[PDB]
A = this chain, B = another copy of it.
C-alpha cells in the first residue's frame, strides 16, 4: 500500500485532551494511533509533532516497513536522539497506526503478529476513583464504589489534590505530609486487608522526606509506590529503593529502550510502567518489556487517554510474558464533555478486561465524534 494522508485530532474529552492520528492508504485501509499526551501541558505540541513527522516521513510511503519508518524518524528527526515525551509520543502514535494497518492487511490482531497471546483477559486496578476527595474520610468514602464494582486493586495520589496538582518544589508542610499518611491509612482501613493499594507520588519530595514517608506507610501493606522521586534523578531512585521497604514502580516518564536501559542498570525497580503512547510504540514497548525480563521485572503498562490507547494497550498485554496488571480510569467516561472515540470501547467486567479479537488494534473510530476536533490534515 501507499500512505495517502494523515489526519491529526486534538480532542477535548472531559479533563483530558486526547491526541489522535489517522493514517489513510490508497487501498482504503486506515490505521489509528494515539499520542500519550492526553493530560499535563503539551497536547498542542504533540499534535504539531505528529504533523511535522507526517509531512516529512509518511506521505507516499509503504506502511508495511514499520521498522524502517521508525528507524527513519529516529535517525533523521534530529530531536529523537535523547528525545523526550513529545517526539516519541508523536512517533508512538504513528507506529500504532502502522501496526493497525498491518494487522488489518493480514486480518489478525496485532498480538498475533507479536507472537500470539498468553492470556485471554487481564485484571485491572482502578484509578481516578478518589474523585475530589481531600480529607481522609472522603478518601475512605470513595473506596466503596470501585470495590463494589469488582476491583481488587486501587491506586491514588496521597500527596496531590484536585484543583489534580502534584507537589510544588518537592516540599510540603508537616500538616500536609501528615494528611497524606492519614489518607493512605484511611484507604487501607476502608478497603480491608485484602485489597491491593498502589501509591503514586508523581515525583515525591526531596529524598530524605520521601524515604521517611514511604517507611511510615510501610505498615499499611503497599503493593508499590510509583515515581518516588523526579524521573530526572536516577541516583535518588537507587538511594530510595535501598532505603525503603516498599516495591518501586517507574516508567510513565521514561522513553524507548534507550531510556529504560538507564532504569534497568539501576536494579532499583521491580516494576516498569511504560506507556505505549510515549515509550515509542507497540513494538518498541514490547522490546522494552522483553529487556525488563532480563532484569527480573514485571510490567504494569501506564494508560490514560481515550478508549483507543486503552484498547491498543490490551494488544500488548495479551502478548507480553512479564505482565502484571492493567490500569483503568472508570470515572473518566462520566466527565462532562467526555468524547467516546470507539464504536466498541473496552468494557470492564468485575475488574477484568477481555482481549480484543478484531484485526489490527481491533478498534473502529467513530469519525462523527472526533471530526469536530480535526486539527490538521497532511496529503
| A binding-site residues for B, Cβ under 8 Å | 37, 39-49, 51-53, 56-57, 62, 64-68, 70-73, 75-79, 81-87, 90, 102, 106-108, 112-118, 165-171, 174, 194, 196, 202-203, 206-209, 211-212, 224, 229-233, 235-236, 239, 242, 247-248, 253-259, 261, 265, 267, 270-271, 283, 287, 290-291, 293-298, 319-322, 324
Q: How many Å from the CB of A226 to the closest CB on chain B?
A: 13
Query: When the two chains form their complex, are residues B112 and A206 in contact, meaning their CB atoms are under 8 A apart?
Result: no
Q: How many Å from the CB of A46 to the closest CB on chain B?
A: 7
Question: Which residues of B lie under 8 Å from residue A174 when comparing CB positions?
Answer: 194, 196
Question: Which residues of B lie under 8 Å from residue A116 when comparing CB positions?
Answer: 62, 64-68, 102
Query: When the two chains form their complex, are residues B294 and A71 in contact, meaning their CB atoms are under 8 A apart?
Result: no
Please give me the residue from chain B that is nearest to A290 by CB atom: B287
Q: How many Å from the CB of A237 to the closest CB on chain B?
A: 9
Query: Which of B48, B64, B102, B290 contacts A44 (CB under 8 A)?
Result: B48
Complex Cα distance A333/B348, Å?
A: 52
Given A44-B52, A206-B298, 13 additional A-B pairs, CB 8 A: A40-B79, A41-B76, A42-B78, A49-B86, A62-B116, A71-B169, A75-B167, A83-B253, A84-B84, A208-B271, A209-B247, A235-B295, A265-B265
Query: When the two chains form their complex, are residues A79 and B298 in contact, meaning their CB atoms are under 8 A apart?
Result: no
Question: Which residues of B lie under 8 Å from residue A66 when comparing CB positions?
Answer: 115-116
22 A-B pairs with C-beta separation under 8 A: A41-B57, A42-B87, A45-B90, A49-B86, A67-B114, A71-B118, A79-B84, A79-B86, A81-B231, A83-B84, A83-B85, A83-B232, A83-B253, A84-B255, A86-B87, A170-B298, A209-B247, A212-B247, A239-B267, A258-B294, A287-B287, A290-B290
Query: When the two chains form their complex, are residues B297 and A206 in contact, meaning their CB atoms are under 8 A apart?
Result: yes
Complex Cα distance A337/B253, Å?
A: 39
Query: Which of B107, B108, B257, B267 contacts A235 (CB under 8 A)?
Result: B267
Query: Which of B65, B117, B253, B258 contacts A65 (CB under 8 A)?
Result: B117
Q: How many Å from the CB of A280 to the closest CB on chain B?
A: 11
Question: Which residues of B lie under 8 Å from residue A39 when comparing CB positions?
Answer: 78
Q: How many Å from the CB of A350 to the closest CB on chain B?
A: 15
Please give me the residue from chain B that is nearest to A232 by CB atom: B258
Complex Cα distance A224/B211, Å?
A: 13
Query: When the two chains form their complex, are residues A42 and B258 in contact, meaning their CB atoms are under 8 A apart?
Result: no
Q: How many Å from the CB of A232 to the closest CB on chain B?
A: 4
Question: Which residues of B lie under 8 Å from residue A62 when comparing CB positions?
Answer: 116
Query: When the two chains form their complex, are residues B37 and A42 in contact, meaning their CB atoms are under 8 A apart?
Result: no
Query: When the two chains form their complex, are residues B196 and A76 in contact, meaning their CB atoms are under 8 A apart?
Result: no
Question: Which residues of B lie under 8 Å from residue A40 when comparing CB positions?
Answer: 77-79
Q: Which 10 pairs of residues, A with B, have the shortest CB-CB distance?
A: A84-B84, A208-B270, A40-B78, A44-B48, A82-B231, A208-B247, A45-B49, A86-B86, A48-B48, A41-B77
Complex Cα distance A75/B203, Å?
A: 9
Complex Cα distance A239/B106, Å?
A: 44
Question: Which residues of B lie under 8 Å from residue A79 when comparing CB positions?
Answer: 37, 40-42, 84-86, 253
Given A118-B68, A232-B81, A321-B71: A290 touches B257 (CB 8 Å cut-off): yes
Query: Which of B48, B212, B231 contacts A46 (CB under 8 A)?
Result: B48
Centre residue among A56, A70, A233 by max chain B CB count within 10 A? A233
Complex Cα distance A196/B111, Å?
A: 41
Query: When the two chains form their complex, are residues A207 and B296 in contact, meaning their CB atoms are under 8 A apart?
Result: yes
Question: Which residues of B lie under 8 Å from residue A64 when comparing CB positions?
Answer: 112, 116
Complex Cα distance A270/B167, Å?
A: 17
Question: Which residues of B lie under 8 Å from residue A46 when comparing CB positions?
Answer: 45, 48
